[PDB]
Amino acid sequence: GSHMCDAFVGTWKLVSSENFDDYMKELGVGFATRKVAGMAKPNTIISVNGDVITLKTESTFKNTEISFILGQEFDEVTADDRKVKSTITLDGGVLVHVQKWDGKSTTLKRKREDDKLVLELVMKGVTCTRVYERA
Ligand SMILES: Cc1nc2ccc(Cl)cc2c(Oc2ccccc2Cl)c1C(=O)O
Numbered sequence: 001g002s003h004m005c006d007a008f009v010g011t012w013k014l015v016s017s018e019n020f021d022d023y024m025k026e027l028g029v030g031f032a033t034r035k036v037a038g039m040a041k042p043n044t045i046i047s048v049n050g051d052v053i054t055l056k057t058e059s060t061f062k063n064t065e066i067s068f069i070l071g072q073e074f075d076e077v078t079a080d081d082r083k084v085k086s087t088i089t090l091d092g093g094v095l096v097h098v099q100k101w102d103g104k105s106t107t108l109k110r111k112r113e114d115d116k117l118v119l120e121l122v123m124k125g126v127t128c129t130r131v132y133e134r135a
Contacts, residue, residue, distance in 0.1 A: 004093050005048055007112045012044045012132035015116075023121050023128035027106065029080045036061050037079065043135055044117075053088070 017038075024034045042059040054067040062079045068088050076086040076099065084099040097108040106123040117132040 003048070004090050005053060005095075007093070008046045008095065008110065008117065009048055010046060011135040012046070012117050013135040014041045014043075014130060015133045016131045017128070018130075019126065019128040020121075020130065022126045023123055024080065026123035026126045027080060027082070033080060044132060 020038060021034055024037060029037070040059040040061060042057050045054075045056045045058075047054045051069050052067055053070070054065065056066075057064045057079065059079075064077070064079050066074070066076055066086070068074050068086070071087065071089050073085055073087045076084050078084060078099065082099070082101050084101040086097060086099045088095055088097045090096070093112065095110040097110070099106050099108070104123075106121065108122075109120040111118050111120075115133060119128075119130040119132070121128040121130065
């Protein structure tokens with residue numbers, strides 16, 4: 001059968017970024033990692049096997065991989081090496097990813113808009129948008 005996650009499945013490459021440096025500062029990312037991360041053009045591969053969604057991100061300097069069930073909290077190590085407790089849910093057709101660590105929180109929303117995969121990353125007052133297109 002068809003699922004709301006179907007539209008996300010596939011291989012994606014970064015095409016544009018807005019306010020990523022500010023967002024990384026809010027996360028506590030240091031100067032050098034901000035420079036190196038800002039240069040990268042990651043690929044993200046989203047796949048589904050039964051109820052398990054896998055999201056991989058590959059880049060020149062860092063690869064990440066999470067597998068999860070919607071609504072079930074899990075341990076995640078982020079690209080900037082935060083050790084977080086994460087939960088990912090569907091809100092309509094938007095994947096909502098909340099990461100909690102040291103009493104802090106950031107929310108990452110993934111949505112399909114036109115032929116793009118749009119990521120909205122929010123920490124305190126700062127919103128970054130990262131746009132991906134099919135690879
Ligand atoms: C959502 C997201 N969050 C990030 C959080 C922190 C950093 Cl340093 C990179 C991030 C990042 O880029 C990367 C994610 C993995 C490897 C490399 C990069 Cl630059 C993404 C992203 O666009 O998927």
